[PDB]
Amino acid sequence: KKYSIGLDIGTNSVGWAVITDEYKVPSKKFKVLGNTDRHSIKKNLIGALLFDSGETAEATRLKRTARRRYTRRKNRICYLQEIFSNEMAKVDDSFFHRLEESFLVEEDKKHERHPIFGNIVDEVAYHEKYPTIYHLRKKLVDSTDKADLRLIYLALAHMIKFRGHFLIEGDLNPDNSDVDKLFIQLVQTYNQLFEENPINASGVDAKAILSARLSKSRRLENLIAQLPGEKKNGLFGNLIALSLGLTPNFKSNFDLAEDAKLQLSKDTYDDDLDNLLAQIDLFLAAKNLSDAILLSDILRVNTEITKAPLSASMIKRYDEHHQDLTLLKALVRQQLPEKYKEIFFDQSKNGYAGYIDGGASQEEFYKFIKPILEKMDGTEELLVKLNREDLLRKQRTFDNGSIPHQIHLGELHAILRRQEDFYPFLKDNREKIEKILTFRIPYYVGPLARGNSRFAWMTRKSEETITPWNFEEVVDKGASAQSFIERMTNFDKNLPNEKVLPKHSLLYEYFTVYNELTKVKYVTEGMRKPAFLSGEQKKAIVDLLFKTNRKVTVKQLKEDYFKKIECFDSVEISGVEDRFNASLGTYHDLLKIIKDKDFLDNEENEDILEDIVLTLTLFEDREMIEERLKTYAHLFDDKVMKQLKRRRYTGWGRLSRKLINGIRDKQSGKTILDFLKSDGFANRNFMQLIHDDSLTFKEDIQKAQVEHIANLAGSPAIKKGILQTVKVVDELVKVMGRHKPENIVIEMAETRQITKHVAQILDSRMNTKYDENDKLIREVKVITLKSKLVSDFRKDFQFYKVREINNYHHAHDAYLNAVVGTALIKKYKGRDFATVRKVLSMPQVNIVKKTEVQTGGFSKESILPKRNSDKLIARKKDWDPKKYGGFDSPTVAYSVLVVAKVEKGKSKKLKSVKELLGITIMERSSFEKNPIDFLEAKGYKEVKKDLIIKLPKYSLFELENGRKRMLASAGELQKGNELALPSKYVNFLYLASHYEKLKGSPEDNEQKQLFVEQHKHYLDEIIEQISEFSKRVILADANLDKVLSAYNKHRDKPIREQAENIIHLFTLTNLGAPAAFKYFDTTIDRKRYTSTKEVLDATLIHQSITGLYETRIDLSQLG
RNA sequence: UAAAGAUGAGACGCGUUUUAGAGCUAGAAAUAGCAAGUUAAAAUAAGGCUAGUCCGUUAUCAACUUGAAAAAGUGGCACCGAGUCGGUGCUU
DNA sequence: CTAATCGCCAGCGTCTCATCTTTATGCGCCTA
DNA sequence: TAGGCGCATCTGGCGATTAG
To answer: Residues annotated as region RuvC-II?
Structure first.
């Protein structure tokens, strides 16, 4: 048949050959279908398939989580409104209506332009009293008097929208800033309780607090400098545990059980405090100090006369910026003229022009402003502020990101406690408002769907809508967490219907250690062949050794077993090594927590113990572990539960319950574990037992073992090439008669990657035969091959290639993969070389660009300012493009050809027209079901439905003199022709590019140097070839003469310095989008084909995925 | 073995757009001189219904047939030749 | 006057949690 | 003998411009 096929899968291109008759490229005759009277097309069987790269789901997941966050925030505001409505409907009119209707202009607005009150005098009075919301915040904290419901609503709404980073567990007191002056008190309390009175430096407390804050990695040296005398505990990390937190875990001075390794500020810190206090101070004020340092890091209030230090700090920022601005305004206008307009009265330049109503930022403003005040007198008073980057500060910036929800929590609680006397309506909802602050959906629950979504898994205990106040009542948290863990854990491959066991469970880990110890054998001095341990001595080992010491087999069970066999020592062991692998760590952990070993060794309650390990391996949070352990609280409450809940396990296994102890053999009545315990004189392991001869374990395995195989990870770009290659082979088998190919060769898209499993799909499809001994034979081979062979063959036999000329190189790589792969097989190098030279020279290579309907975002994301243009598209249907707009430049999906009548001019007499029209992504579905209505609504009339042709991206057109174009946009054309550059220029041009690098160490340097020196006329001949090809198919005469002028002048550096730049003229000639390029000093701008009108009267081509079957439509006949 | 990604789940801080923050003085304006600037509301793919505190940017893509559809179909041969596929003979 | 040319512009940084797969090691083994 | 299994160790859009 000589149907040896080949392939070269890639990220953006898949190549293919079809046969290797005489290990040569074949040629074959095909006919076409369509209006053209041609049928004698004799093609090659070589081709390449180019396509866009496959994108990952990371960006899509990011936008999905973003819109989920947005709608949850809107629902939080809606809950806020639901609480406030019953009194705001009586205190105000259309309040939330006018807050929702703030986008619209005064013509579209229905109530009032002013969003807060609805009056102008009250608005300006409110703004002059409070220039910033934080002034109102401080007023509602320190007022001690009743205020307006609208203002307190704005305060709570501000905190609910802008909430906090949610990273600190526990609580922080808002008034814990005077305790920052009690750091000396804390250290002196530690001194008086200690028995050496350690010394300290007074007045350095705040200085050392900011010094250690700046010295994040030099905190050791900072603590050594701040604490004199004894500093071993400070260098160990005790003082950093007091101030910053116990980031390390090393022991400083012990004194609390084994070591002081408890968490500083977390959910487990309170539980770990009981264990530290059991072996018992300084921690009580150390926690307050840890609050104080983080408070003073971000909230700088020197004297505590307020309970709202965030608002106090923002007021200080406002006052500093105002005072220093009115200093600079009076200084610059009196010292430096001719700049005042540029800094103060500009908008489109950096400085204070762009810092307020322009697009400039803080860094650009600082960089602009430094030379301005670097040269005047009375300076450096602001350069010192500039060096600390707190010059002319604004409040709402990036720096207020570390703001704690604990501070907003206690701050809102402070306002509610202050104001609850005056308003009894919202006193009763204080706890649920506080919940609305603190409500988060846990990460193990997921979206609150009903199974229609492909992402949610949560199980509802009760059927009701989910609110923050009924979350624990409606949602069953334990089953939801179990499903969350189980939906992403793999199944066991032997039987895919059951879940696998945890890595550190009793039965599982016991089977691992039993599988090792059954393989552990003993050798005799009499009989040379060692016999397996077996007997009841397998039982005797584990209870006497493994149930007593953690990791008994670390060069230690050896001497322990030698003492056991001290009279049996004529018989010696033949174990794997001195240190074994498995252990009874879970056994000994729960042993050291438990006080009863009888039931544990009784090996009967392992059903209970499996659930015991299951909860600790599955779940994380202490309370939600606790509720599941409450079933055994009838006996495990007092002396177990205090220590067992602190233990947690991490790790999942690969075997399952049903396989390991469910399936037993009827001839013996014993399961696999009992087979390992009492297998007889011959002990078979897991692999030997499951696939043993005359064993019924294989029949039950095959009973349950009998497009979805593509999910093999390896990025979501490679899978596109895999499926395209499968489709290409599937469609090629149809073309080449109906016979099955000889063999398949596939390329790299390490050998352990997705390619090995990708070959198996080709096996499963091609070697499809009867299971009984017909699929046992392999009619066809599928081969994957290492790239070093084809690269060395490339360097050996002079088939070089630069990637910048043409896309024929993809198909030639696929061809060379097939040739060398088949060449290794036929003899178990040849006469091929002249034939392969001929093959790579050939001008007809079936290059197709995969026509694809575009999907993705509708348009650009930036919201542009309003303008009098039709390019802008309304952001929402409610709004208007020219009024607000901002969304322009949409991405089209595909084009269509249409012929119809249309009216134009003042005559209103109708003319006929034939057009190409592009459809956008946003309107595609509207086109599909309403084409006849959609094009008539868009402007045509009396349209003929049967003449409409759909045209995706990269639709191919053919014009006069063999000129082809591809259509990417609606009306922008891309180059469709390829430069069939002969091999004489390529062989020269590679060696010219390699004039000084990799020209051949074994005296191959000199010959290749003189070859390109003596063939320098090839430079001129390539310029003529590019020129002739460009005048015929490219039509780039202006850029061509520009290039010719640059080529003629740049000849003083004529050896290979042309050649690297000559590679850049091929950027003009390649297929696809035109690209700008540089040629020596001159830079050549791209020329863009807008004239889509010429393809209306051209010939349209439809091509198969391999390109061998074509369909041509003559658009002149349709006109 | 640490990194490395690849998947889902829960949260922050900016940015943009429109709107609200009464501009004054002398001049026909031409404009000129002058105060002033730090904040807030709404939206954050149009939208879809199953009306969920859910879904909407990943992956799927030649025409001509029969299928409402999953799909199943669909168009001879060999030598001699190369400028983006031609010549000739067998052949039915 | 309506169609080619030229220059410019494209939404962003941090946290927390889980699973699985890979650069590279064996031990006990097995099927084709 | 290869292949598997269990456990660990940038390129289309758009406004301003020129111009055939």
So the answer is: 707-749
